[PDB]
Design a protein around this ligand. Structure first.
Ligand SMILES: C=CC1=C(C)[C@@H](Cc2[nH]c(/C=C3N=C(/C=C4\NC(=O)[C@H](C)[C@H]4CC)C(C)=C\3CCC(=O)O)c(CCC(=O)O)c2C)NC1=O
Ligand SMILES: C=CC1=C(C)[C@@H](Cc2[nH]c(/C=C3N=C(/C=C4\NC(=O)[C@H](C)[C@H]4CC)C(C)=C\3CCC(=O)O)c(CCC(=O)O)c2C)NC1=O
Ligand SMILES: C=CC1=C(C)[C@@H](Cc2[nH]c(/C=C3N=C(/C=C4\NC(=O)[C@H](C)[C@H]4CC)C(C)=C\3CCC(=O)O)c(CCC(=O)O)c2C)NC1=O
Ligand SMILES: C=CC1=C(C)[C@@H](Cc2[nH]c(/C=C3N=C(/C=C4\NC(=O)[C@H](C)[C@H]4CC)C(C)=C\3CCC(=O)O)c(CCC(=O)O)c2C)NC1=O
Ligand SMILES: C=CC1=C(C)[C@@H](Cc2[nH]c(/C=C3N=C(/C=C4\NC(=O)[C@H](C)[C@H]4CC)C(C)=C\3CCC(=O)O)c(CCC(=O)O)c2C)NC1=O
Ligand SMILES: C=CC1=C(C)[C@@H](Cc2[nH]c(/C=C3N=C(/C=C4\NC(=O)[C@H](C)[C@H]4CC)C(C)=C\3CCC(=O)O)c(CCC(=O)O)c2C)NC1=O
Ligand SMILES: C=CC1=C(C)[C@@H](Cc2[nH]c(/C=C3N=C(/C=C4\NC(=O)[C@H](C)[C@H]4CC)C(C)=C\3CCC(=O)O)c(CCC(=O)O)c2C)NC1=O
Ligand SMILES: C=CC1=C(C)[C@@H](Cc2[nH]c(/C=C3N=C(/C=C4\NC(=O)[C@H](C)[C@H]4CC)C(C)=C\3CCC(=O)O)c(CCC(=O)O)c2C)NC1=O
Ligand SMILES: C=CC1=C(C)[C@@H](Cc2[nH]c(/C=C3N=C(/C=C4\NC(=O)[C@H](C)[C@H]4CC)C(C)=C\3CCC(=O)O)c(CCC(=O)O)c2C)NC1=O
Ligand SMILES: C=CC1=C(C)[C@@H](Cc2[nH]c(/C=C3N=C(/C=C4\NC(=O)[C@H](C)[C@H]4CC)C(C)=C\3CCC(=O)O)c(CCC(=O)O)c2C)NC1=O
Ligand SMILES: C=CC1=C(C)[C@@H](Cc2[nH]c(/C=C3N=C(/C=C4\NC(=O)[C@H](C)[C@H]4CC)C(C)=C\3CCC(=O)O)c(CCC(=O)O)c2C)NC1=O
Ligand SMILES: CCC1=C(C)[C@@H](CC2=N/C(=C\c3[nH]c(C[C@@H]4NC(=O)C(C)=C4CC)c(C)c3CCC(=O)O)C(CCC(=O)O)=C2C)NC1=O
Ligand SMILES: CCC1=C(C)[C@@H](CC2=N/C(=C\c3[nH]c(C[C@@H]4NC(=O)C(C)=C4CC)c(C)c3CCC(=O)O)C(CCC(=O)O)=C2C)NC1=O
Ligand SMILES: CCC1=C(C)[C@@H](CC2=N/C(=C\c3[nH]c(C[C@@H]4NC(=O)C(C)=C4CC)c(C)c3CCC(=O)O)C(CCC(=O)O)=C2C)NC1=O
Lengths: 300, 164, 65, 177, 164, 177, 177, 164
C-alpha cells in the first residue's frame, strides 16, 4: 500500500524480443516525460539501444545513454532555465520532488563547475537512484509511504499533473517571450517556461492543492462513485414529444413510438441504399471484359 | 479490479497498440465462464444471511476464547462486528464473483489486511475457521453446478491464501 | 560517498539490510564476487583462465575458477 | 479503470448491498450482445490507420488555415504529432468499445487533455471536428456502410451499440472543447 | 509472440502473483476460437502457391513500372524475390494464424519493415495492392468457416495497417 | 532542522551578536531538565503502537460515518494507510520531544499536509480529533496516569514539559485544520 | 516466451515451412486436453501457500542443520526469504502448467539461479529437496490424493499431465544442482 | 537550427566555460564560407519558380501513375500541393543555405517526415526523382559561382540522404 498497486507499469526480465520492445518503449516514455520522439530523434540515441538489446550494458545505463543524447539535451537542458533544467532532469530520472534548496543548489553548483554531462552522471550514479530502482526497473511514478518531506509527494504530484498531460507550455512560453502568436514559436524548444516549483522551493510553503489532485490515479471507490446515477422511471406511461432533426433547419416532431417507426422506415430504404455495391462489384467484373481484350490482343 | 478485460486493455495500452485478436479471444472466454459465475452470484445473493450466520457460529464454535475477557468479541456489539465483517467478506466474494477476477476483492479487502489484523490484535486464524467452514460445507450437485460451486470455492480459496 | 568503480568491485550485500529492492539473477551473473588469480607455476595450470580482468568484474564464475 | 461489470460492482458498493436480479439481467443483455461488440471492435481496428488518415486530411481540408503558415498543422514535425494524436484518440475510443464503460477513457486520456490543448494553443474546435469525422467514420464502419469496405457477417441489429460508440466520440469532442 | 497465454502469463508475472481465474477464462477463450483459426491455417497450407501467384500477378497488374528500368523488379530473379517475399508473408500469416496473436508476424516481419522499404527503395503500396487483392478474392462461405474467413481477414488487415 | 540549541544560535545570528548570559541560562535550565525530557521520550516510545491503536479506534468510534460505506476509513487498504499516518504523526511528535524545538516537525511533516488532506478528501476535523486523542493519551503517559501502566521512577515536577508536548499536538491539530 | 502453440511455430520456422497436419493434430490433442490442464492449474493454485508451508517445513525437518545456528534457514529474515523463494518457484511452475512449454520458466527463473545460489552459499541439495517435496505434493493435489482435500470433479485420465508437471519440477531440481 | 555558432555556443555552454579561441576559429570559418553560401541563396531566391516547375514536371515525367487514380494526387489541386511542397523544400534549402547548417531544414522539414509519408501514402521516391533532377541539372560554373554550386549540391544531398 502506497498507491503503487493501483498504477500499472510492467517491466519483465528480458526473455524474448517482445519484452525488449516493451521495455525500450517504456524507457522513452519515462526519459522524455511523454515527449514525442520522431524517427530522426529516435535515431539520435541509437548506440545505447544496441548495447542494451545485446544486454552488454545494463538498464540504468540505457537510461543514461538516452539522457545524454542531443535531443533530450536540446529539449530539457538547453532551452530551459537553470532551475527548470534541474527539476526536469530531476523529474525524468529520479521521479520525485526536489526535497530542499540545498539539494537543488548543490546540483546547480555542480552545473556551474562541470556542466550537463557530469550532472547526468550525478543523477544516475546517485545512491537513492540505485536502491530506489537499479538495473531492475525503468524509472516511474514513485509512491513510498515513508516520505522524507511531506512536501515531496505534494510537489511531485504538481510536477506530474495529468497522466495524459505533458511538460511543454507554449502558451506560457509564448506570453513571456515577445511573440503575438504562440504557434509561431519553435516547437523543438518549449520545456523552458518559468520553473513551477521554485516559488515553493525557496519559500518552503503553501503548495497548491488543485494541481496535486490531477496527478492522483483514479480511485475506484471515490471519484467513480459520484459520477453515474440515472435510474428508474416514475411513470409507466409518460409520452414526451421530443424533437429529432433531418437537417440544420428542418425539424421533426415525433413521439418515441412514432420516431421508432420512422427509424425503421429509414432502415427499410437503407437496404435499398446499400444495394449500390452490387452495382459496384458488377462494374468491376467489367475489368474482366477489358482483360478479355488484352487476351484477344495476345492471341492476335 | 483486475479482470480479463482490464488486464487485456491495460496490456495493449502498455504496448500502446490497438487490441489484436488475442484480447478478443480473452473476453470471448469471459462471456464463456460468465453464466457459471453469475449463477453463483445469484445463489449467494439468495441465502447470504444464513451463510454469515453459520460462518460466525462456527467461528465462535472453534474458538471460545473470543468471548473470554477483553481480548476479542466479548460484547454483543463486537459479535455484531463479527457478522458485519463476514457480511463484507461475502459481499466482496459476490463482487469478485460477478467480475470474474479477484480485483475488487483484492483492492478492497485483501490489500493491507495484515497490518490492521496485527495492529488491532485480530487473529486471522478465526477468519480461516469461518471460511474453511463455508469451504467444507459447499454442496456437490445439490444447489449450483460444478462450475458455479468450483468458481465459488476458487474465490474463497484465494481469500484463504491471501489471508494467511 | 564511495566511488562507483569500487562499488562495482565490491560484494553484493544482503537483502534485509543492504538493499530494499530484491535483485535479479542476471545481476549476480554480471558483477557478484570478483577476485583475480595469482600467476600459476606449472605447464598444467596456465592456459585455462585469465589471471585477472581490469575495468571488468565477473561474478560467480570467479568462485568456480 | 472500470469494466461495465465493475461499474455494476461500484454501483452495488455505493448502494452497499449485493448485486440483485436487475443489474444481473442488464449484464446478461451485455453478455448476449457481447459478440456484436467484439465484431465492432474488429471493424474499427481493421481500418484504424485509414480512418486517422482520412479524418485528419478532412480536417485540414475544411479549413486550410491550419496548414497556412503560422498554424499548428503548418510544419512537418507538428503534422507528425497531429497524426499521432488522432491515432491515440482512436485507440482509447476502441478501448472504450471493448470496455462498455467510459471510465478508462475518462481517467486515462480525457483528463487534462483540455488543459494540455489550452497550454499548447491547439484550436479546440478543429480537434472536435476531427473527433466528429472519426465519429461518423466509425459509425459507417460499424454499420458496414463504408463505400470501400464490405465485411461478410450475418445481418442483425446493432444500433444501440452504434449509439454507444457515438456517445463515446461525443464525450471526447464535448470534453476537448 | 504475443498471444492470449503470453499476455496473461506476462501480466500475472508482472503482478508477481499466481494465475487467478481471469487468465484461466482467457485461455478458455483461446481454445474456443482455436478451431476456426486452425481451419484457416489448414486451408492456407492447402493452396498458398496459387495465393502468392494471384497476389504477385495482381501486384504487377496494378503497377507496370516495377518492370520499367532499373528501379524495381526488372529481372526474372527479382520477381522471384517478389513471390519469395509474399511466400514469407503468407508464411507469417499462417504462423500468427496458428498462434492466434499477431506476435510472430509482428516480431519477424513487421518490426523495422519501413526502414528496409525506404532504404532499398521498395514502395509499400505494391504490397498493399497484393494483400488487398487477395483479400477481396477469398470467399465468404465455400472456402472456410464463417469465423475462419473473418480470422484470416483480420490478420491480413493487421498486415495492411502495419505496413502503411 | 533546528535544535533548541540551534534555535538560540539563529536568534543570536538574527541579533548578529554573541550568545550572552541569559540565553545560556535558559539553555542551562534545558540541560538540567533534559533527563526528564529523555524519560518522557522513553514513555511515549514504549507505548506508541498502543496509543495509535486506541486513538484511531476511538476516532472511528466517535463517528461511525468514517466506517460507513463510502467513507475514508471504509475499506481495508485505506484503514492500513490510516494506521500508518497516525503512527508517523506520533513519530514526528516524538522527534519534537527530543528536540525541544518544533522546527523539525514544522518543516518536515507539518508543511503541505493540510493541502494534501484537502487534495485527497480526508476530513480534517476527524484528523484533528485523532491528534487530540493522542494529545491526552500522551499527557496521560507522560504523567504516569495511565490506567494500565506504571513506571517506577522518582517523583518530580514535569508539568512544563507536559504543556510543551501538548503545545506540539495543538500545533499539529491546529495546522491540519 | 513460448507457448506450446509458439513452440510449434518456432519448430516450423526452423523447418522453414508451414504448419502441416501432424503438428496441428498434436495441438488438437492439447486443446482437447486443455480443460483438464486448467482444472489442474486451479488445483495447484487453490492450495499453493499451504504447499509452500508444508514443503519448506519438511525441508527443515529432514535436516535440522539448516536451523542450527550459522545455517541459512537460521534466522528470522532469512526464513522469510526462504518462504518467499519457495512461493516464487511454485509460481513459475504454475505458469509452466498453463503454458505447456517450459521456455517461460527456462528463460525467466531457471536461468542464472544455480550460480546465484552458488554465489550466496545456499545449499543446492536442500533446494532440490524442497522442489521434490513440491513435486510429490503437486502430483498428489493434481490427482486428488491429498489426505485433507477433496474436489468434486468427474473422473478421467490425467496421468500424462501429471508426468508433465513432474517433468517441470524435475527440470527445476535438476537445474538448481 | 544547428549551425557553427549554435554548436560552439551549446558546447561551451555544456562545459559551462567561457568561449576559448577554438570557437572563435570556428565562426571565423563561418564568415569564410559565408559569401559562397549567400551567393547561392541570392540566385535561389532569383529563379525558384522555374526550379520548382522543372522539378515537379520531371517528377510526373518519371512517374505517370501519380495521376493514375487515387494512388497519387490526380487533381489539379493535388498537383498544386505538389508544387506547394517543393516550394517549401526550396524554401528550406534557402533557409539552411543562409544558416550554413542543416538545422532549420532538419527541424522543420526532415524530422518526422517518414511517418507522414508512410501514413498519407506518399511515396518518397518521387521526391527523390525531383531532387535528383535538380541535382543533375546544376551546370556548376556559368550557372553560379562554382563554390556556391557545391554548397547547394551538398545541402540537397543531405535532403536526399535524409529522405530515403
Ligand atoms: C556503436 C557501434 C555499434 C555497432 C557496430 C552495432 C553492433 C551490433 N549489431 C547488433 C545486431 C545486429 N547486427 C546485424 C548485422 C548483420 N547482419 C548480417 O547479415 C551481417 C552479418 C551484419 C551486417 C554486416 C544484425 C542482423 C543484428 C541483429 C542480429 C540478430 O538479432 O539476430 C547488436 C546487438 C543489438 C541490436 O540488435 O541492435 C550490436 C551491439 N551496434 C552498436 O551500437
Ligand atoms: C599462466 C598465465 C596466464 C595468463 C597471463 C593469462 C593470459 C590470458 N588471458 C586470456 C584472456 C583475457 N585476458 C583479459 C585481460 C585483459 N582485459 C583488459 O581489459 C586488459 C587489456 C587485460 C588485463 C590487463 C581478457 C579481457 C581476456 C578475455 C578476452 C576475451 O575473451 O575477449 C586468455 C585466453 C583464455 C581466457 O579467456 O581466459 C589467456 C591465455 N592466462 C594464463 O593462463
Ligand atoms: C474472436 C472474435 C470474434 C468476432 C469478431 C465475433 C464474430 C461473430 N459474430 C457472430 C454474430 C454476430 N455478429 C453480429 C454483428 C453485426 N450486426 C450488424 O448489424 C453488423 C453487420 C455487425 C456489427 C458491425 C450479429 C448481429 C451477430 C448475430 C447474427 C445473427 O444471429 O443473426 C458470430 C456467431 C456467434 C454469435 O452469434 O455470437 C461470430 C463468430 N465472434 C468472435 O468470437
Ligand atoms: C493520452 C492522450 C494524449 C493526447 C490526447 C495527446 C495530447 C498531446 N498533443 C501534444 C501535441 C500535439 N498535438 C497536435 C495535434 C494537433 N494538430 C493540429 O493541427 C490540430 C489542432 C491537432 C489535431 C486535431 C500537435 C500538432 C502537437 C504538437 C504541437 C507542437 O509541437 O507544436 C502533446 C504534447 C507532447 C507531444 O508533442 O506529443 C500532448 C500531450 N498526447 C497524449 O498522451
Ligand atoms: C521474413 C520476411 C522477409 C521479407 C518479407 C523479405 C523482405 C526483403 N526483400 C528484400 C529484397 C527484395 N524484395 C524485392 C521485391 C520486390 N520486387 C518488386 O518489384 C516489388 C516492389 C517487390 C515484390 C512485391 C526485390 C526486388 C528485392 C531485391 C531488391 C534489390 O536488390 O534491388 C530484402 C533484402 C534481402 C534480399 O535481397 O533478399 C528483404 C529483407 N525478406 C525477408 O526475410
Ligand atoms: C486458404 C484460403 C483460400 C482462399 C480464400 C481461396 C482463394 C481462391 N479462390 C480461387 C478461385 C475462385 N474464387 C472464386 C470466388 C468468387 N466468385 C465470385 O463470383 C465472387 C467474386 C467470389 C466469391 C465471393 C471463384 C469464382 C474462383 C474461380 C475463379 C475462376 O476460375 O474463374 C483461387 C484459385 C484456385 C481455385 O480455382 O480454387 C484461390 C486461391 N483459396 C484458398 O486456398
Ligand atoms: C511525512 C509525512 C507524511 C504524512 C503525514 C503522510 C500523509 C499521506 N497520507 C496518504 C494517504 C493516506 N492517509 C490516510 C489516512 C487517513 N485515514 C482516515 O480515515 C483518516 C481521515 C486519515 C487518518 C487520520 C489514508 C486512508 C490514506 C490512503 C488514502 C487512499 O488511498 O484512499 C498519502 C499518500 C500516499 C499513501 O497512500 O501513503 C500521504 C502523502 N505521508 C507522509 O509521507
Ligand atoms: C538513556 C536513557 C535514559 C533515560 C530514559 C533516563 C531515565 C532516568 N531518569 C532519571 C531521573 C528522573 N526522571 C524523571 C522523570 C519523570 N518526572 C515525572 O514527573 C515523570 C514520572 C517522569 C517523566 C515522564 C525525574 C523527575 C527524574 C529525577 C528523579 C528525582 O531525582 O527525584 C534517572 C536518574 C539520573 C537522573 O537524575 O537524571 C535516569 C537514569 N536517563 C537515561 O540515561
Ligand atoms: C475457468 C476455470 C475452469 C476450470 C478449473 C475448468 C473446470 C472444469 N473441468 C471440466 C471437466 C473436466 N476436468 C477434468 C479434469 C480431471 N481429470 C482427472 O483425472 C482429474 C481428477 C482432473 C484433473 C486434475 C476432466 C477429466 C474433465 C472432463 C470430465 C468428463 O467429461 O468426464 C469442466 C466441464 C467442461 C469440460 O468438459 O471442459 C469444467 C468447468 N474449466 C474452467 O473453465
Ligand atoms: C524469479 C525467481 C526467483 C527465485 C527462485 C529467487 C532466488 C533468490 N533467493 C535469493 C535469496 C535468498 N533465498 C533464500 C532461501 C533459502 N533459505 C534457506 O534456508 C534455504 C536454503 C533456501 C530456501 C529453500 C535466502 C535465505 C535468501 C537470502 C540469502 C541471504 O541474504 O543470506 C536471491 C537474492 C535476492 C534476495 O535476497 O531476495 C534470489 C535471486 N529470487 C527470484 O527472483
Ligand atoms: C514545411 C514543409 C512542408 C512540406 C514539404 C509539406 C509536406 C506535406 N505534404 C502533405 C501532403 C501532400 N503532399 C502532396 C504532394 C505530392 N503529390 C504527388 O503526386 C507527389 C508524390 C507529391 C508532390 C511531388 C500531396 C498530394 C499531399 C496530399 C496527400 C493526400 O491528402 O492524399 C502534408 C500533409 C498536410 C497536407 O495535406 O498539406 C505535408 C506535411 N508540408 C509542409 O508543411
Ligand atoms: C476534399 C477534402 C475532404 C476529405 C479528405 C473528405 C473527409 C471526410 N470523410 C468523411 C467520412 C468518411 N471517410 C471514410 C474513410 C474513407 N472512405 C473509405 O471508404 C475508405 C477506405 C477511407 C479511408 C481511405 C468513411 C468510411 C467515411 C464515412 C462516409 C462513408 O460511408 O464513406 C466525411 C464526412 C464527415 C461527416 O459525416 O461528418 C468527410 C468530411 N471529405 C472532404 O471534403
Ligand atoms: C467506547 C469508545 C471509546 C474508546 C475506544 C475510548 C478512546 C479514548 N481513550 C482515551 C484516552 C486514553 N487511551 C489510552 C490508551 C489505552 N489505555 C491504556 O492503558 C492502554 C494500554 C491503551 C491502548 C490499548 C490512554 C493511556 C488514554 C489516556 C487516559 C488514561 O490514563 O487511560 C480517551 C480520552 C480522550 C481525552 O482525554 O480527551 C478516549 C475518548 N473511549 C471511548 O469512549
Ligand atoms: C515434522 C516436519 C515435517 C513436515 C512439515 C512434513 C512435510 C512432508 N510432507 C510430505 C508430503 C506431503 N505433504 C502433503 C501436503 C499436506 N498434506 C495434506 O493432506 C494437506 C492439506 C497438506 C498441506 C496443508 C501431501 C499431500 C503429501 C504427500 C503425502 C500424503 O499423501 O499426504 C512429506 C513426504 C515427502 C516424500 O514423500 O518424500 C514430508 C517430509 N513431514 C515432516 O516430518
Amino acid at each position: 500500500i502506497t498507491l503503487d498497486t493501483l498504477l500499472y507499469h510492467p517491466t519483465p526480465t528480458i526473455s524474448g524480443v517482445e519484452d525488449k520492445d516493451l521495455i525500450c518503449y517504456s524507457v522513452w516514455k519515462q526519459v522524455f516525460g511523454n515527449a514525442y520522439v520522431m524517427e530522426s530523434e529516435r535515431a539520435d540515441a541509437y548506440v545505447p539501444e544496441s548495447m542494451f538489446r545485446a544486454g552488454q550494458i545494463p538498464l540504468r545505463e540505457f537510461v543514461r545513454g538516452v539522457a545524454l543524447s542531443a535531443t533530450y539535451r536540446r529539449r530539457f537542458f538547453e532551452c530551459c532555465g537553470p532551475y527548470r533544467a534541474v527539476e526536469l532532469n530531476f523529474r525524468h530520472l529520479l521521479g520525485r520532488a526536489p526535497v530542499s534548496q540545498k539539494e537543488v543548489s548543490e546540483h546547480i553548483k555542480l552545473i556551474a563547475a562541470k556542466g550537463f554531462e557530469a550532472e547526468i552522471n550525478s543523477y544516475i550514479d546517485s545512491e537513492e537512484y540505485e536502491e530506489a530502482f537499479g538495473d531492475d526497473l525503468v524509472p516511474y511514478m514513485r509512491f513510498k509511504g515513508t516520505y522524507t518531506t511531506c512536501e515531496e509527494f505534494n510537489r511531485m504530484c504538481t510536477m506530474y499533473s495529468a497522466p495524459g498531460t505533458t511538460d511543454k507550455s507554449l502558451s506560457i512560453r509564448a506570453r513571456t517571450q515577445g511573440i503575438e502568436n504562440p504557434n509561431h514559436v519553435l516547437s523543438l524548444d518549449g520545456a523552458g517556461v518559468p520553473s513551477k516549483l521554485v516559488s515553493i522551493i525557496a519559500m518552503g510553503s503553501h503548495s497548491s492543492f488543485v494541481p496535486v489532485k490531477r496527478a492522483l490515479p483514479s480511485r475506484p471507490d471515490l471519484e467513480f462513485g459520484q459520477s453515474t446515477k440515472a435510474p428508474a422511471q416514475v411513470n409507466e406511461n409518460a409520452n414526451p414529444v421530443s424533437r429529432v432533426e433531418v437537417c440544420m433547419g428542418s425539424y421533426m416532431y415525433l413521439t418515441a413510438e412514432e420516431a421508432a417507426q420512422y427509424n425503421t422506415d429509414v432502415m427499410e430504404q437503407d437496404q435499398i441504399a446499400s444495394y449500390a455495391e452490387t452495382e459496384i462489384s458488377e462494374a468491376e467484373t467489367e475489368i474482366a471484359r477489358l482483360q478479355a481484350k488484352i487476351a484477344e490482343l495476345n492471341l492476335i | 479490479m483486475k479482470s480479463v478485460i482490464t488486464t487485456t486493455i491495460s496490456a495493449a495500452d502498455a504496448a500502446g497498440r490497438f487490441p489484436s485478436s488475442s484480447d478478443l479471444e480473452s473476453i470471448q472466454g469471459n462471456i464463456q465462464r460468465a453464466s457459471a459465475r453469475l449463477e453463483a452470484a445469484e445463489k449467494l445473493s439468495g441465502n447470504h444471511e444464513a451463510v454469515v450466520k453459520e460462518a460466525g457460529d462456527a467461528c465462535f464454535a472453534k474458538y471460545s476464547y473470543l468471548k473470554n475477557s477483553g481480548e476479542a468479541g466479548d460484547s454483543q456489539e463486537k459479535i455484531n462486528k463479527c457478522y458485519r465483517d463476514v457480511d463484507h467478506y461475502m459481499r466482496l466474494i459476490n463482487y469478485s464473483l460477478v467480475v470474474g477476477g479477484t480485483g475488487p476483492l483484492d483492492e478492497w479487502g485483501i490489500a493491507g489486511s495484515r497490518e490492521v489484523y496485527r495492529t488491532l490484535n485480530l487473529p486471522g486464524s478465526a477468519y480461516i475457521a469461518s471460511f474453511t467452514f463455508t469451504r467444507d460445507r459447499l454442496c456437490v450437485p445439490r444447489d449450483m453446478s460444478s462450475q458455479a460451486g468450483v468458481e465459488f470455492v476458487a474465490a474463497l480459496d484465494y481469500v484463504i491464501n491471501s489471508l494467511s | 560517498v564511495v566511488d562507483p568503480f569500487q562499488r562495482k568491485f565490491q560484494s553484493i550485500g544482503k537483502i534485509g539490510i543492504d538493499y530494499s529492492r530484491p535483485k535479479k539473477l542476471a545481476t549476480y551473473k554480471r558483477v557478484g564476487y570478483s577476485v583475480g588469480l595469482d600467476f600459476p607455476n606449472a605447464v598444467s595450470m596456465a592456459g585455462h583462465y585469465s589471471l585477472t580482468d581490469c575495468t571488468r568484474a565477473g561474478g560467480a564464475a570467479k568462485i568456480l575458477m | 479503470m472500470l469494466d461495465a461489470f465493475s461499474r455494476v460492482v461500484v454501483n452495488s458498493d455505493s448502494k452497499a448491498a449485493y448485486v440483485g436480479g436487475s443489474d444481473l439481467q442488464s449484464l446478461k443483455t451485455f453478455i448476449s450482445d457481447g459478440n456484436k461488440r467484439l465484431d465492432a471492435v474488429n471493424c474499427i481496428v481493421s481500418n484504424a490507420s485509414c480512418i486517422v488518415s482520412d479524418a485528419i486530411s478532412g480536417m485540414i481540408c475544411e479549413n486550410p488555415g491550419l496548414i497556412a503558415p503560422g498554424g499548428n498543422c503548418y510544419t512537418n514535425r507538428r503534422m507528425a504529432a497531429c497524426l499521432r494524436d488522432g491515432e491515440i484518440i482512436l485507440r482509447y475510443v476502441s478501448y472504450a468499445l471493448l470496455a462498455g464503460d467510459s471510465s478508462v477513457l475518462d481517467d486515462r486520456c480525457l483528463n487534462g487533455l483540455k488543459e494540455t490543448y489550452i497550454a499548447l494553443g491547439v484550436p479546440t474546435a478543429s480537434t472536435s471536428r476531427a473527433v466528429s469525422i472519426m465519429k461518423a467514420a466509425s459509425t459507417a464502419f460499424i454499420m458496414n456502410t463504408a463505400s470501400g469496405r464490405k465485411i461478410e457477417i450475418a445481418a442483425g441489429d446493432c444500433q444501440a451499440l452504434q449509439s454507444e460508440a457515438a456517445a463515446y466520440f461525443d464525450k471526447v469532442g464535448s470534453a476537448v472543447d
